[PDB]
Short mmCIF file of C-alpha atoms in Angstrom, two decimals:
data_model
loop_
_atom_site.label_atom_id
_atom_site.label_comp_id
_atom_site.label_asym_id
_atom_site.label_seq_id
_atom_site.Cartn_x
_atom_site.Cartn_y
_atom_site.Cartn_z
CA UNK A 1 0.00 0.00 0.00
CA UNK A 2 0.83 3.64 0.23
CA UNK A 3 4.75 4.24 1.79
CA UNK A 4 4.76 5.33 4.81
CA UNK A 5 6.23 8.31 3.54
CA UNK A 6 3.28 9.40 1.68
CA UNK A 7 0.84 8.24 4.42
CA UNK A 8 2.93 10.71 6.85
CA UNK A 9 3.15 13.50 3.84
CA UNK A 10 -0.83 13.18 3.70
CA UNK A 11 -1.71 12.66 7.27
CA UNK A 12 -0.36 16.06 8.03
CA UNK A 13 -2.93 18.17 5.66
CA UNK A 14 -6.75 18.74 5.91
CA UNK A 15 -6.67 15.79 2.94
CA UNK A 16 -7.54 12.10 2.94
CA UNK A 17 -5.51 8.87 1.75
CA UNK A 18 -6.91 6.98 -0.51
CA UNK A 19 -5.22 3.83 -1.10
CA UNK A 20 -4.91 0.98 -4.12
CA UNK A 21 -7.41 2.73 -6.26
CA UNK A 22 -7.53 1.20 -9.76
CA UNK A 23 -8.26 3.82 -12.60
CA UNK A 24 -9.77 2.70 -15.34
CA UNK A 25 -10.73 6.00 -17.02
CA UNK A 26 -8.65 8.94 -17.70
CA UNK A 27 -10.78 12.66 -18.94
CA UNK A 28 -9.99 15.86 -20.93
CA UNK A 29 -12.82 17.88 -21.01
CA UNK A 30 -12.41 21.54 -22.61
CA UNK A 31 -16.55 22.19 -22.10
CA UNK A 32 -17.35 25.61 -20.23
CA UNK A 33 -18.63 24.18 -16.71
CA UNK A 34 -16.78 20.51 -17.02
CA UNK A 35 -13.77 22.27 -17.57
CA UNK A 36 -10.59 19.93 -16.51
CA UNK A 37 -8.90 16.59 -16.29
CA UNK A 38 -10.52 14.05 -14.06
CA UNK A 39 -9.90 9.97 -12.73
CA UNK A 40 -12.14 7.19 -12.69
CA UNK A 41 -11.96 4.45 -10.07
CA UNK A 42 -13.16 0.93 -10.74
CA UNK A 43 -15.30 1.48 -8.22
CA UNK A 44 -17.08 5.11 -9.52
CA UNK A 45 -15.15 7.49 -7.88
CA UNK A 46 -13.98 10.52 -9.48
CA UNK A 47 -11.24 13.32 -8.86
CA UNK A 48 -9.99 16.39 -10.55
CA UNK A 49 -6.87 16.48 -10.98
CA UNK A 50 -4.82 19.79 -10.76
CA UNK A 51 -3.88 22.29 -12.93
CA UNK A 52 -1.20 25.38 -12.47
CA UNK A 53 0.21 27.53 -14.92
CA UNK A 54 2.88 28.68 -12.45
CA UNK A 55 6.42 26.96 -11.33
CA UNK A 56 6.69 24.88 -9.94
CA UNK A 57 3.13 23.32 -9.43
CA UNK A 58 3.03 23.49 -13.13
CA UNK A 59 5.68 20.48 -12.81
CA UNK A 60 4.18 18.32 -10.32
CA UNK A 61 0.55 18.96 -12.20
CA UNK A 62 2.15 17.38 -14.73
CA UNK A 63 3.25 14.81 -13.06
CA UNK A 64 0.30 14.02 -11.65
CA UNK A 65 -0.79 13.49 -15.39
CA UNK A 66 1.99 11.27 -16.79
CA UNK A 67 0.91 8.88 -13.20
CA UNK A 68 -2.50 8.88 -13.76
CA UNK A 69 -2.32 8.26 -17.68
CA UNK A 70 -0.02 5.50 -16.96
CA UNK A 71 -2.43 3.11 -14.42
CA UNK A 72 -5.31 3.51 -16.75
CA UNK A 73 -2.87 2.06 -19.23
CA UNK A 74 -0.64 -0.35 -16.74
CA UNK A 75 -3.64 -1.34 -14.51
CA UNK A 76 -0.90 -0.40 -11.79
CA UNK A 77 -2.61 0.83 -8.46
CA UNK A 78 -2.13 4.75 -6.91
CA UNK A 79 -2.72 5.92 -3.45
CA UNK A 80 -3.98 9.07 -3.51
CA UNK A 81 -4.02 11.94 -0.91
CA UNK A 82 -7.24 14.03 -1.92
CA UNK A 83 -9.33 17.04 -0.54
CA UNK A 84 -12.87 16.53 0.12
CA UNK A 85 -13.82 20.08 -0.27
CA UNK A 86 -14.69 20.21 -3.76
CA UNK A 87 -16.45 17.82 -6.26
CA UNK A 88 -14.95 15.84 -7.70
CA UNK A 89 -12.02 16.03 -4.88
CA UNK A 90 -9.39 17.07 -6.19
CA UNK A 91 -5.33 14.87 -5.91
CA UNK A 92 -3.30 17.15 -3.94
CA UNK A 93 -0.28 14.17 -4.19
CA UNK A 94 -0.45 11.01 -5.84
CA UNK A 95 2.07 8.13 -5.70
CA UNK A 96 2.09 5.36 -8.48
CA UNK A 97 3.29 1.85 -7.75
CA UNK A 98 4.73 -1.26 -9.33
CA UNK A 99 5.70 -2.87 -6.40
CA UNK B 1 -19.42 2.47 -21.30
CA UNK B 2 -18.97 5.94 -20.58
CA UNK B 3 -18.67 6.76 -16.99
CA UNK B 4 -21.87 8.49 -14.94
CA UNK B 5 -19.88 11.74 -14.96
CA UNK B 6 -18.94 11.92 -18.40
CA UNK B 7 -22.46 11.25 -19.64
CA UNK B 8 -23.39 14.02 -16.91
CA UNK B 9 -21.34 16.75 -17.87
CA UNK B 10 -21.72 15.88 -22.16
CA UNK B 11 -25.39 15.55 -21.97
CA UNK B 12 -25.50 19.41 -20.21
CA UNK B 13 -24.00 20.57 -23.34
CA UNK B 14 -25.15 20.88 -27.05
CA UNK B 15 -23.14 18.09 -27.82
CA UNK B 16 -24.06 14.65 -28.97
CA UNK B 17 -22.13 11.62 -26.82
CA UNK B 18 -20.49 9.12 -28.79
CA UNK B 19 -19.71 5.87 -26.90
CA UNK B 20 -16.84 2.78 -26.97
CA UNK B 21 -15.56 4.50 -30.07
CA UNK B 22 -12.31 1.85 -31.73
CA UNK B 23 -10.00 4.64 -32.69
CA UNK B 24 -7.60 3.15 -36.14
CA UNK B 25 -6.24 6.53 -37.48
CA UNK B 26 -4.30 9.47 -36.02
CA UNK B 27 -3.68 12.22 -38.43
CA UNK B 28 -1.66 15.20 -38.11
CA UNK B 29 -1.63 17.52 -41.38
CA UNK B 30 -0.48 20.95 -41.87
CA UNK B 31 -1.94 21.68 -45.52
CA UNK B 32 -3.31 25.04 -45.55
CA UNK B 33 -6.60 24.24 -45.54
CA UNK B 34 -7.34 20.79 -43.83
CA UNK B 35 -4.90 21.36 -41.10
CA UNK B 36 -5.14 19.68 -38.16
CA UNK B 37 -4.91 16.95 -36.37
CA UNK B 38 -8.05 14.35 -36.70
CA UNK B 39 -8.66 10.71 -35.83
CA UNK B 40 -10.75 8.23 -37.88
CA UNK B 41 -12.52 5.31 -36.34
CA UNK B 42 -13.41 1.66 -37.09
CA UNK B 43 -16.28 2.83 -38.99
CA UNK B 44 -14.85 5.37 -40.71
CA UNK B 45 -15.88 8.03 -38.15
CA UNK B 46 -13.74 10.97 -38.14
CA UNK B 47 -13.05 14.02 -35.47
CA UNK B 48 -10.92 16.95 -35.63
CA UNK B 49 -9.50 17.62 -32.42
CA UNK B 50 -9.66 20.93 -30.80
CA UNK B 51 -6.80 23.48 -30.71
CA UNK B 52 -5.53 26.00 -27.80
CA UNK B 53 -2.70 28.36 -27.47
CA UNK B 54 -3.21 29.84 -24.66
CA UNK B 55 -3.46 28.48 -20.49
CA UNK B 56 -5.76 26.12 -19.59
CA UNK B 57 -6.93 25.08 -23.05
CA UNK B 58 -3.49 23.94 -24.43
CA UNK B 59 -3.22 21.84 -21.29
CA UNK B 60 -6.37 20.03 -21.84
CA UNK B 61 -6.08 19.67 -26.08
CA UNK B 62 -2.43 18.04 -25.43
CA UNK B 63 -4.08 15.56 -22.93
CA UNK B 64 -6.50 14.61 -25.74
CA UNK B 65 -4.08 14.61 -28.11
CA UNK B 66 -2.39 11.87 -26.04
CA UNK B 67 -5.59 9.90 -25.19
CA UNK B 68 -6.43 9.50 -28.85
CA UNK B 69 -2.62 8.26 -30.14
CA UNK B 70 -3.10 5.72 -26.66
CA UNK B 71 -6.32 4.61 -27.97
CA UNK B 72 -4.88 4.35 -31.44
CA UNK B 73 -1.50 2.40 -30.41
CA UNK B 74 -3.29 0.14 -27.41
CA UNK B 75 -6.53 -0.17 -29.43
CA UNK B 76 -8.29 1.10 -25.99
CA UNK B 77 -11.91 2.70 -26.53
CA UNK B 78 -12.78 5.85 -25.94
CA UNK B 79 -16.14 8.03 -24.99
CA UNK B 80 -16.27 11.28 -27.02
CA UNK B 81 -18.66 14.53 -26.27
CA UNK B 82 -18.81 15.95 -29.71
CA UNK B 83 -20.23 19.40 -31.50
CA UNK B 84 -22.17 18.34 -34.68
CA UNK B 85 -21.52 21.84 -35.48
CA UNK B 86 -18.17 21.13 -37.47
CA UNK B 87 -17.14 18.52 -40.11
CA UNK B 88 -15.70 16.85 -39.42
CA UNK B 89 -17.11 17.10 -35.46
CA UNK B 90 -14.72 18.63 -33.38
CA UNK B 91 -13.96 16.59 -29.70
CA UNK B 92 -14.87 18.78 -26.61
CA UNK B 93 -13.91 15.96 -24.41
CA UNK B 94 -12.79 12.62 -24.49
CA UNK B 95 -12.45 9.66 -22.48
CA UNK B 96 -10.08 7.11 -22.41
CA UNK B 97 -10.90 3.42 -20.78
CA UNK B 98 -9.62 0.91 -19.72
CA UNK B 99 -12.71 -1.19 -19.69
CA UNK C 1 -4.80 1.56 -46.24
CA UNK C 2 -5.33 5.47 -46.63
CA UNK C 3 -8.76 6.84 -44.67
CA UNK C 4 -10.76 8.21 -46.96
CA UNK C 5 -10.73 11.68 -45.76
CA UNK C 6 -6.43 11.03 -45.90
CA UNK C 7 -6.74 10.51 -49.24
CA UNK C 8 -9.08 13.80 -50.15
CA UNK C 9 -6.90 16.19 -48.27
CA UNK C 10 -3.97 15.44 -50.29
CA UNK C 11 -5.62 15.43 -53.91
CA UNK C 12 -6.34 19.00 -53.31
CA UNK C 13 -2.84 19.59 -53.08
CA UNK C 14 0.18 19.93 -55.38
CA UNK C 15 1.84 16.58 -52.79
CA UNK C 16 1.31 13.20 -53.51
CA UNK C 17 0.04 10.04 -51.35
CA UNK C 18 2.10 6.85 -50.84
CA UNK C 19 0.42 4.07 -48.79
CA UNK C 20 1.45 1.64 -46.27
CA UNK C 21 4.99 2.59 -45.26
CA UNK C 22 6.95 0.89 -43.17
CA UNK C 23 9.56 3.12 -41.33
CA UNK C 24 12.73 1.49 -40.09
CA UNK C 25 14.88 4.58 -38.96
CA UNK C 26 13.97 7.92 -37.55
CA UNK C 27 16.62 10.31 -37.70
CA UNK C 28 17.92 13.44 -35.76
CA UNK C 29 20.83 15.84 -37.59
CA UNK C 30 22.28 19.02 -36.08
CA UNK C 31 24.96 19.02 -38.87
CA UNK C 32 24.95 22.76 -40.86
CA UNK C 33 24.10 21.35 -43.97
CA UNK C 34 21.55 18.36 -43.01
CA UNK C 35 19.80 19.48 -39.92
CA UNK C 36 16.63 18.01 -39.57
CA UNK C 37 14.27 15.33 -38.75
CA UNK C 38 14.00 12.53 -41.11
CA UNK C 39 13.00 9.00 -41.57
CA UNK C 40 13.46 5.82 -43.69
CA UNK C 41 11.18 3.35 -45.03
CA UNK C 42 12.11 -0.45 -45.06
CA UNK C 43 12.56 0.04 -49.51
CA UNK C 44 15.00 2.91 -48.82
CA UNK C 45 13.05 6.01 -49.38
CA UNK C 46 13.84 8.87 -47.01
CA UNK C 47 11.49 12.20 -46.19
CA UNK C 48 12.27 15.04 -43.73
CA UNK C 49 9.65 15.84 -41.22
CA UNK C 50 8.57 19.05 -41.47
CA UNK C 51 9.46 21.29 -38.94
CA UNK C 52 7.71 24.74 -37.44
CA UNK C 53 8.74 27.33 -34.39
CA UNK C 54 5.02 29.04 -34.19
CA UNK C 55 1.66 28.09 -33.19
CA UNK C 56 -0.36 26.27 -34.42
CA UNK C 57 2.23 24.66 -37.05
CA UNK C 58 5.10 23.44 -34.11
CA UNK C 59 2.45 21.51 -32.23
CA UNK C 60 1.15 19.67 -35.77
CA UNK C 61 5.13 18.91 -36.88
CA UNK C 62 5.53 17.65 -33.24
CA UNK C 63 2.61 15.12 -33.75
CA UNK C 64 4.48 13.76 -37.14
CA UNK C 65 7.26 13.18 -34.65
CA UNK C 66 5.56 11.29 -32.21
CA UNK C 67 3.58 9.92 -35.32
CA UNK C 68 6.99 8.75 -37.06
CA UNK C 69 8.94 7.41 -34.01
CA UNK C 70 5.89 5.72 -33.04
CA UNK C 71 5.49 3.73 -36.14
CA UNK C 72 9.91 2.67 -36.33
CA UNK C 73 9.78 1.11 -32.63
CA UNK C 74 6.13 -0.39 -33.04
CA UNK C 75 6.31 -1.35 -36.53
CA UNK C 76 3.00 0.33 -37.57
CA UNK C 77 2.45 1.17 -41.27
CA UNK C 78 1.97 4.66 -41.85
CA UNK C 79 0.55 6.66 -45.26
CA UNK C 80 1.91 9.93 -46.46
CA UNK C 81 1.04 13.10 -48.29
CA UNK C 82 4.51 14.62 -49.15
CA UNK C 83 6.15 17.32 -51.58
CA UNK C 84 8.45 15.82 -54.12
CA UNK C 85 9.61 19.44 -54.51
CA UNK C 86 12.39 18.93 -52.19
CA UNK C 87 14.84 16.26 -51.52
CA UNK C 88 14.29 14.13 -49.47
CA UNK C 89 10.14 14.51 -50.12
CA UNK C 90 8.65 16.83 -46.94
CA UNK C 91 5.84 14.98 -45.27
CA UNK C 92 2.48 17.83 -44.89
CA UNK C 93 0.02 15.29 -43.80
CA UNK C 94 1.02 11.88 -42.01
CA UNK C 95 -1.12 9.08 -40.78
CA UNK C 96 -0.53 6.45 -38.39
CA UNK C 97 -2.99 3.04 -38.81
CA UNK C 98 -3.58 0.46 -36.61
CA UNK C 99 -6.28 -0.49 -39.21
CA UNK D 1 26.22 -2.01 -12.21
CA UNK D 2 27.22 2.25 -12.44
CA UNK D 3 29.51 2.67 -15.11
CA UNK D 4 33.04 3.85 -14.45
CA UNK D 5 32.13 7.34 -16.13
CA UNK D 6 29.22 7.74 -13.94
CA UNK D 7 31.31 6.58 -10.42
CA UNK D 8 34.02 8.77 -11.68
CA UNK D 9 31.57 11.81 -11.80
CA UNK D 10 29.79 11.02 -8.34
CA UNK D 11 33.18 10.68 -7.01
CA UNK D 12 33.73 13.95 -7.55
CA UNK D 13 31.52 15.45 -5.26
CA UNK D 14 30.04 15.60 -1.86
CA UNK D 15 27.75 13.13 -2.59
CA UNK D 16 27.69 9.28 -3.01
CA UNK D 17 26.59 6.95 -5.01
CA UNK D 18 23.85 4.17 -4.46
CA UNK D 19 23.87 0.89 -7.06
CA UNK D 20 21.44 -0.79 -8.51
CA UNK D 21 18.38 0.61 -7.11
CA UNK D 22 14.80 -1.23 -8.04
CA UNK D 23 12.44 1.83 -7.99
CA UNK D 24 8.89 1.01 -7.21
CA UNK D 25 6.90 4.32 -6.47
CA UNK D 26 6.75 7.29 -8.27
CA UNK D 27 5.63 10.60 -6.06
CA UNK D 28 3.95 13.89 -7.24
CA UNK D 29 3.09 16.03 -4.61
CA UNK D 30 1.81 19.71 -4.45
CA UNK D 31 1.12 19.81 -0.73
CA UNK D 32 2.71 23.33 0.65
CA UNK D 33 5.58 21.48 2.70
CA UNK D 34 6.05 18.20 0.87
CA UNK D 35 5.70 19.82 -2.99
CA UNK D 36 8.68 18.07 -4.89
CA UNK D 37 8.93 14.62 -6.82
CA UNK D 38 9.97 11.77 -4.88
CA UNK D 39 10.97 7.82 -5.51
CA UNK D 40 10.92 5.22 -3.12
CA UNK D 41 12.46 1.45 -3.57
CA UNK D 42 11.69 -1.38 -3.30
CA UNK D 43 13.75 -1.80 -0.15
CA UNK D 44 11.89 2.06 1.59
CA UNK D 45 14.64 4.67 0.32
CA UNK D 46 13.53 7.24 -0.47
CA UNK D 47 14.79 10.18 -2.57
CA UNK D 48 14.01 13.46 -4.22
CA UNK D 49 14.16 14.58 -7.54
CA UNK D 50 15.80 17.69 -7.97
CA UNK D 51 13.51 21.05 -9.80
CA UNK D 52 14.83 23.57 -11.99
CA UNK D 53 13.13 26.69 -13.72
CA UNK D 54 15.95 27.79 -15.62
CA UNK D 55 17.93 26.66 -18.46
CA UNK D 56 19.81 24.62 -18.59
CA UNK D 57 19.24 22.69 -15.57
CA UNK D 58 15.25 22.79 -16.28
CA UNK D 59 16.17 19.94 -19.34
CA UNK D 60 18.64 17.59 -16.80
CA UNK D 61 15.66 18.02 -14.29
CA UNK D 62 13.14 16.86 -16.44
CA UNK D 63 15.36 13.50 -18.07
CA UNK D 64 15.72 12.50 -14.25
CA UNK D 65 11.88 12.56 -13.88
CA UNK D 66 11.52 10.53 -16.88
CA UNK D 67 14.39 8.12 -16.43
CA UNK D 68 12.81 7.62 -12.52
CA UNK D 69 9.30 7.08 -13.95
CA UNK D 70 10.50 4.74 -16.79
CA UNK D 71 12.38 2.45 -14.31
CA UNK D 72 9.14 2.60 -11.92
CA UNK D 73 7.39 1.18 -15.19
CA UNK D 74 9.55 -1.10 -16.81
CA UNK D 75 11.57 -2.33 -13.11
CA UNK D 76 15.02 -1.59 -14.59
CA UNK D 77 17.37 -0.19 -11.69
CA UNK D 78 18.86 3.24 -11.57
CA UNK D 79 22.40 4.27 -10.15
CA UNK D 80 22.07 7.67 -8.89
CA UNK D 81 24.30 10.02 -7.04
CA UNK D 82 22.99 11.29 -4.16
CA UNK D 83 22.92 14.25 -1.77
CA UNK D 84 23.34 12.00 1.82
CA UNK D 85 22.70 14.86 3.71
CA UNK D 86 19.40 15.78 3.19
CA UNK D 87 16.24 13.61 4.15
CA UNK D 88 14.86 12.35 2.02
CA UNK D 89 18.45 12.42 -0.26
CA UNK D 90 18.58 14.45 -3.15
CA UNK D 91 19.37 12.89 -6.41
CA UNK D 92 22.05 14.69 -8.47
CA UNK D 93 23.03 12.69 -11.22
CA UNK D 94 21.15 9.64 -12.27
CA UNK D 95 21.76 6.42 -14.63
CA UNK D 96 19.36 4.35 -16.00
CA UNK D 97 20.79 0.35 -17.05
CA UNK D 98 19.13 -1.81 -18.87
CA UNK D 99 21.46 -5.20 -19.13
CA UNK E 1 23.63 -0.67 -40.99
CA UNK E 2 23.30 3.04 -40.96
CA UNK E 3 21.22 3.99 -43.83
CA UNK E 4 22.88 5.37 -47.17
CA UNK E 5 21.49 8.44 -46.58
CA UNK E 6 22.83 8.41 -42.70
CA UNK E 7 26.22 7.71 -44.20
CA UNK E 8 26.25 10.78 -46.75
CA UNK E 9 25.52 12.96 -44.63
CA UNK E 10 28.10 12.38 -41.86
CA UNK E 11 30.69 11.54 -44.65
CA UNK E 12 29.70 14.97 -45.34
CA UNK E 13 31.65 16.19 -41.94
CA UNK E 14 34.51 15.86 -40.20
CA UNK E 15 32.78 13.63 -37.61
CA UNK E 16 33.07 9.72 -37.66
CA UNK E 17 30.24 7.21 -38.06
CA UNK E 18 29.54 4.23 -35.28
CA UNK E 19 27.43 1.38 -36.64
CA UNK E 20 25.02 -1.08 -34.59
CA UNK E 21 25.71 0.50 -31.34
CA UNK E 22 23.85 -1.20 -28.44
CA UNK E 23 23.23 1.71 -25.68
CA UNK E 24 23.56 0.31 -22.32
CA UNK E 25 22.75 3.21 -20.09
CA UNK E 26 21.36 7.01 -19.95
CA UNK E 27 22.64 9.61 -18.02
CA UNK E 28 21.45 12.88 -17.00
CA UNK E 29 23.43 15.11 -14.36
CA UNK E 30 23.50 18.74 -13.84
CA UNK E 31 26.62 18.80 -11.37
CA UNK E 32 28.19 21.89 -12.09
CA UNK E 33 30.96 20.75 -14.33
CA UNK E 34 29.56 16.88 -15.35
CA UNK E 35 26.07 18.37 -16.31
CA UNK E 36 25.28 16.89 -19.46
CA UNK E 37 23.13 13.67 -21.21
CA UNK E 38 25.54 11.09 -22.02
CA UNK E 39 25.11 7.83 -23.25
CA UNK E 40 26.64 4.68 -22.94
CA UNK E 41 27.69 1.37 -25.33
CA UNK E 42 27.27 -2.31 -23.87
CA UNK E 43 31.88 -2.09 -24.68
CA UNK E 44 31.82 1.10 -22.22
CA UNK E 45 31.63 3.59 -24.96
CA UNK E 46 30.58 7.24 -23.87
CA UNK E 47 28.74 9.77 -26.15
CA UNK E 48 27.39 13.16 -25.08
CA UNK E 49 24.19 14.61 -26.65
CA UNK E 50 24.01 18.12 -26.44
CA UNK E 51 21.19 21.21 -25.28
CA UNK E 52 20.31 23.70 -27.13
CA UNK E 53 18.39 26.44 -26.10
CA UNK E 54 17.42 27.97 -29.05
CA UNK E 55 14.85 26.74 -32.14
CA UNK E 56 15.68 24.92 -34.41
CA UNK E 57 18.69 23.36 -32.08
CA UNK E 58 15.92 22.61 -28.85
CA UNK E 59 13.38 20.24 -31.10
CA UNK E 60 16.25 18.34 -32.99
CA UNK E 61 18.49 17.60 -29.80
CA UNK E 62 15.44 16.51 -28.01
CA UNK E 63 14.72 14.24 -30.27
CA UNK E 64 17.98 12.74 -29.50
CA UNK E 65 17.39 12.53 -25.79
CA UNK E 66 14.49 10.36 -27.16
CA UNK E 67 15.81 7.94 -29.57
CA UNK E 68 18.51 7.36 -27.15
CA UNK E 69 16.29 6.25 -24.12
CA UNK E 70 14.26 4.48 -26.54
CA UNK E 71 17.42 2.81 -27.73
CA UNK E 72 17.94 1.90 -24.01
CA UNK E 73 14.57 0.90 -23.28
CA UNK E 74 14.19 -1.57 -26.14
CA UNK E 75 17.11 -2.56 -26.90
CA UNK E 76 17.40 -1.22 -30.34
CA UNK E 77 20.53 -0.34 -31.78
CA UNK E 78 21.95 3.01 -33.45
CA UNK E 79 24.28 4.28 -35.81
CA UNK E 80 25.59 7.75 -34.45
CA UNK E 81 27.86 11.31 -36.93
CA UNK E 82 30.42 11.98 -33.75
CA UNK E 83 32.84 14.06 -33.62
CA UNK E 84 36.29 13.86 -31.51
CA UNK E 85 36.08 17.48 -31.41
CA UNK E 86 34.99 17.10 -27.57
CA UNK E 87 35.26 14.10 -24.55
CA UNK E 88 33.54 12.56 -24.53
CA UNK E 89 32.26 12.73 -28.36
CA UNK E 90 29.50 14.47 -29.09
CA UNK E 91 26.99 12.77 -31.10
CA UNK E 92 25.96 15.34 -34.38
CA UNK E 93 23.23 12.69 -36.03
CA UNK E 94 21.71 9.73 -34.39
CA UNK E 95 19.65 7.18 -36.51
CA UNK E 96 17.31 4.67 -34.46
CA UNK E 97 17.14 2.04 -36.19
CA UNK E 98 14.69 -0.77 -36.03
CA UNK E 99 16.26 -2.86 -38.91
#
């Protein structure tokens, strides 16, 4: 499951782990109000994943991309650490893994 | 099938949804008039896909651009949320599955 | 083969279509007389990629080089529309079949 | 095992050099204190990549994140030359193997 | 064998051509005076690729960076225009080659 690095790296914000999701859908959506990039779990949940124009988040967003493109593809797992203020909640971290 | 929250956030829109789409073709052509980059399906379907310069747009078009070549090279389906309004239609999101 | 709409786009031009090319090598030159992007077909025949700095041209030329590389390390035929105005023949339209 | 030109170059510097390393998770974090790219192996190291925003070191950063990512992926191990001092360790210099 | 065409051109310069070379390992450091992409031969062999900043120097050299971890990710071999002018070599045309 998650390292314990990322479980410590999460447990200290106002977001929650998620652990050993499997994505099976990845989104681009360019549509006025849907506006984004968003995960599907195999089990219906959904998150936004986020977007910054800025350094260095602009890097990491990225990132976060290139991971989450890769388990649809893989079927490899991700443990996510997401925010449960917004909806979808949106990946603050993610960690990919082959194990 | 497409997931809950694609349907959801296509159906809100003008835009017809097109469902477990088999992607064969990626194009990319810079001819003065037809260019673009488009992608033909199974059925001889074909989409243009949408273009952005500037921030957030050109983050979101380069994401579809690399769902559609993923769908092309893994022969993965896809759910689209076209405009009729163009020929060919023009992709205001995508989504790539895994199943 | 071709797509259909492949096939149209270049008969309104002053290029030419070949069909079902295999590419074996994908080339990168910096030298002062050859730089470039080029690749070579399993017969022999060579074609530069073409190549752009500005929008929206740069991100089309970028897709022929995903489109080209693609097809040399996955062995997937691809069908041209290039300019036998130049030598090597400049690719303006490129498309990459699974089908 | 690290080849004589990289060893030569880690030996250089402050830093040392770790063999062999099996990656297995691949981090992307935004979180205000943890924000950076991390990788973890198989055995619980953990190390992170180094960022950049300027040229050149903005193209070395971004190989590293690709060469860490592709070993998470395809399981080959990394040599990298590492910052000891820090925690997690920074990775300086890194070398993907594939025999 | 490099192709005809591969040959010409880097009998063109001053550089030297190296057939069937079997890349072993990737490299990418930004130590102060080791910074560079380098690239080494299953004999030991080391080649450097080079950065340019500046179009049309930034998309050909990256292209490099990508046949070359190609080359070490699938194990396909390349024929490589480098010149002695610099140690290690720097590599002035690369040709992936999956014949």
């Amino acid at each position: 499951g998650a390292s314990q690095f990322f479980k410590d790296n999460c447990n200290r914000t106002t977001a929650s782990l998620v652990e050993g999701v499997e994505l099976t859908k990845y989104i681009s959506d360019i549509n006025n109000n849907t506006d984004g990039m968003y995960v599907v779990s195999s089990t219906g949940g959904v998150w936004r994943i986020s977007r910054a124009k800025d350094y260095p988040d602009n890097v990491m967003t990225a990132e976060m991309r290139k991971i989450a493109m890769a388990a649809v593809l893989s079927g490899m797992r991700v443990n996510m650490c997401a925010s449960p203020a917004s909806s979808p909640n949106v990946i603050w971290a993610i960690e990919l893994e082959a194990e």
